[PDB]
Amino acid sequence: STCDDEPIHIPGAIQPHGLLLALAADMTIVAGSDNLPELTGLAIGALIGRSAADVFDSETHNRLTIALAEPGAAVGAPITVGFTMRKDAGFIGSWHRHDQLIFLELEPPQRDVAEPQAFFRHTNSAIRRLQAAETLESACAAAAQEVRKITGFDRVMIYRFASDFSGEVIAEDRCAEVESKLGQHYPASDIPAQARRLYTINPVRIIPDINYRPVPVTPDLNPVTGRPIDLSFAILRSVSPVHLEFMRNIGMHGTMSISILRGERLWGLIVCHHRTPYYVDLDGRQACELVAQVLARAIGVMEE
């Protein structure tokens, strides 16, 4: 376990392309990313231990209050965000009720959004083409082709693993400019235990610049538990510089990867790489999110 030891879940930093705010269970600001001042225009060391009401507009707190005290408490779905300071901003992104804190992840207004009809088109065709569920090999390739058709990543591919957690690429499509790993296998050390354990419970992962400077999370002391701040579900979660190397190697300054859950069990991953630094509309992500959700289902009617 030269590999499986790293605490990648508690690195106490996020990627700069958005920010984070962590509230205690009585709705008071507890910790944030240190770039908070840069964009919302509010100084961290001030915020620490004051009210979430100082940052959000009155609805976003209220939509917040209802969502959380909703029964079936869990890492929340995406929310619409407006700040009292810089309302204009209209940042939009998720929240996450883990660690006995309420994490808010906020993203910059994804300008130049997916054309509607084209969107519905690709979403709908895929769910037909995948549900049309030809073989396993197409079901998958399909997902990759379609996924590439939605996002427009330079190369995309379905990765499955054996019971010894070594995987094979079992599908592909590429911009005719980069090799097909369609025949390669890889060793379980490559995506190791703790990262397999993490993908099972949070099925989206996105890195836009592999060449980034991590935005510390301050404090990174969980006030309720007194352990570092645990960034499992955070899609802004700073990433193990080892792996980053391995993406520099294979020549890709952006990634994203989606789990393929098969009854609590991680069957395989959609895996995307893009030469230069590349982002995804929540649209873009939730689409793919969908692809793998159906695929996983168009695997649970191929398993009978």
Ligand X SMILES: *C/C=C1/C(=C/c2[nH]c(/C=C3[NH+]=C(/C=C4\NC(=O)C(C=C)=C4C)C(C)=C\3CCC(=O)O)c(CCC(=O)O)c2C)NC(=O)[C@H]1C
The single residue among 180, 250, 276, 302 that binds ligand X, judged by CB under 6 A, is: 250
**Residue 224 C-beta: closest distance to ligand X, Å:** 24
Among 21, 191, 210, 270, interactor with ligand X by CB under 6 A? 191
Dihedral of CA atoms 83, 93, 124, 121 in degrees, nearest 10, equals 50
- Residue 280 burial (C-beta neighbours within 10 Å; 0-12, 13-18, 19+): buried
Which CB sits closer to ligand X, 42 or 230? 230
151 marked as part of a ligand binding site: no
159 binds ligand X (CB under 6 A): yes
- The answer to whether 84 and 55 are in contact (CB under 8 A) is yes
Question: Quick one: 41 or 187, whose CB is closer to ligand X?
Answer: 187
Check whether 240 is labelled as a binding-site residue. Answer: no
Please identify which residue in 239, 288, 294, 299 interacts with ligand X, judged by CB under 6 A: 239
Contact flags string 161-190 toward ligand X, x per CB under 6 A: --------------------x----x--xx
State how far the Cα of 287 lies from the Cα of 110, in Å rounded to an integer.
Answer: 15
Q: Does 119 bind ligand X (CB under 6 A)?
A: no
The answer to whether the peptide bond before residue 219 is cis (omega within 30 degrees of 0) is yes
For residue 273, say whether it is annotated as part of any ligand binding site: yes
Strands 266-273 and 255-261, sheet pairing: antiparallel
Query: 77: buried, middle or exposed (CB in 10 Å: 19+, 13-18, 0-12)?
Result: exposed
What is the C-alpha to C-alpha distance for residues 186 and 191, in angstroms, rounded to an integer?
A: 9
Q: Which residues bind ligand X (CB under 6 A)?
A: 3, 6, 8, 159, 181, 186, 189-192, 195, 205, 239-240, 242-243, 246, 250, 255-257, 271, 273
